[PDB]
Amino acid sequence: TQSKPTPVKPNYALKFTLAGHTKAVSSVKFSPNGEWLASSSADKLIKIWGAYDGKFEKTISGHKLGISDVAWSSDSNLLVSASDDKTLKIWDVSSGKCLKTLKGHSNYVFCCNFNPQSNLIVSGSFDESVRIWDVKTGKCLKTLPAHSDPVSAVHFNRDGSLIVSSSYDGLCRIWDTASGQCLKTLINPPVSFVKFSPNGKYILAATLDNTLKLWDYSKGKCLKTYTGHKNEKYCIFANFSVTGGKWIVSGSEDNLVYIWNLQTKEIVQKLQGHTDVVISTACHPTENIIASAALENDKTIKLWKSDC
Ligand SMILES: COc1ccc(Br)cc1S(=O)(=O)Nc1cc(Cl)cc(C(=O)O)c1O
């Protein structure tokens, strides 16, 4: 009577191409409430787009140099952005206004995230530090001497008690948010992306040898390896697709979006259409929708939808 769905490949297909950025796109993120897509770019702008119809909503401006990353608060009302101007900015998405500018990094800010409570922001920089910021006061709470090369990614776990960071130094580290102290170091190719898994027990890490790995960070054991894409140069995001079939999703330097079966590690789809490196992908929180974004020969975001 009641059965698990019969597994089938997904059928993501291009629905919309979102044009308007004038330099490379650097990140795309769906709002937690599913209504919006935010994009950031080397053109110093953030743009907001409808998640279901791709329709342009607004441009948010104020950074003085290019932006590498943007991230949503849990209530979908705020964004934080990380810029080459050495700052982060907190934005009210409804008004487009900059609420706070977070100063303290001494070089490009590359990555950022709110914690799920969204009272904190974590950032990673070319200055080799991770900073933890108070959203309400806009002040830095802690500076972690996290790495010995630029920090490529930072992510909180579900209850915000842990931060995972990655770096070109070849390390992934797990930090205690409350104290800022290191809990674990996983180890030497540059690590270009990392995030916690949906069950909170694993980390998904990209390295610049064309490889994604799923690690049990407590045990220090690699559970799965995903290959077939191209990744030797850029920090390319990777995602867990949790709405339908269990997939891993990533961009690639051969201009494709790759989708793998989580368990078997087989490639189940490659999405064709971009004309430069796909630097960022995002998975919609409740529907089978992927956003992808590309570098400066392309400069567009594409929205892809699957029936399962
Ligand atoms: C509930 O967790 C997940 C849900 C969706 C995705 Br996509 C990934 C995870 S996970 O946190 O990565 N856990 C996980 C890891 C592996 Cl290798 C296999 C399985 C499996 O169900 O066969 C699995 O659940």
Swiss-Prot record:
Q: Where is this site: Important for interaction with histone H3?
A: 84, 110, 237, 296
Entries under InterPro entries matching the protein: G-protein_beta_WD-40_rep, WD40/YVTN_repeat-like_dom_sf, WD40_repeat_CS, WD40_repeat_dom_sf, WD40_rpt
Query: What UniProt keywords apply to this chain's record, in alphabetical order?
Result: Acetylation, Chromatin regulator, Host-virus interaction, Isopeptide bond, Nucleus, Repeat, Transcription, Transcription regulation, Ubl conjugation, WD repeat
State what protein this is by name: WD repeat-containing protein 5
Q: Give the protein's biological function.
A: Contributes to histone modification. May position the N-terminus of histone H3 for efficient trimethylation at 'Lys-4'. As part of the MLL1/MLL complex it is involved in methylation and dimethylation at 'Lys-4' of histone H3. H3 'Lys-4' methylation represents a specific tag for epigenetic transcriptional activation. As part of the NSL complex it may be involved in acetylation of nucleosomal histone H4 on several lysine residues. May regulate osteoblasts differentiation.
What Gene3D superfamilies does the record point to?
YVTN repeat-like/Quinoprotein amine dehydrogenase (2.130.10.10)
Q: Which residues carry this modification: N6-acetyllysine?
A: 89
Give the consequence of mutating residue 185 to M. Found in a patient with childhood apraxia of speech; uncertain significance
- Position of the Glycyl lysine isopeptide (Lys-Gly) (interchain with G-Cter in SUMO2) cross-link: 4, 23
The UniProt entry's sequence similarity note says: Belongs to the WD repeat WDR5/wds family.
Assembly, in brief, is: Interacts with PAXBP1; the interaction is direct and links a WDR5-containing histone methyltransferase complex to PAX7 and PAX3. Interacts with HCFC1. Component of the ATAC complex, a complex with histone acetyltransferase activity on histones H3 and H4. Component of the SET1 complex, at least composed of the catalytic subunit (SETD1A or SETD1B), WDR5, WDR82, RBBP5, ASH2L/ASH2, CXXC1/CFP1, HCFC1 and DPY30. Core component of several methyltransferase-containing complexes including MLL1/MLL, MLL2/3 (also named ASCOM complex) and MLL4/WBP7.
Q: Where are the WD repeats?
A: 20-59, 62-103, 105-145, 146-185, 188-227, 230-270, 273-307
Claim: Protease is one of the keywords in the record: no
Effect noted on mutating residue 110 to D: Strongly reduced affinity for histone H3
Q: What is the effect of changing residue 24 to E?
A: Strongly reduced affinity for histone H3
According to the UniProt record, what happens if one changes residue 237 to W?
Answer: Strongly reduced affinity for histone H3
Gene Ontology MF terms in the entry = histone binding; histone H3K4 methyltransferase activity; histone H3K4me1 reader activity; histone H3Q5ser reader activity
| Effect recorded for residue 68 to F | Strongly reduced affinity for histone H3
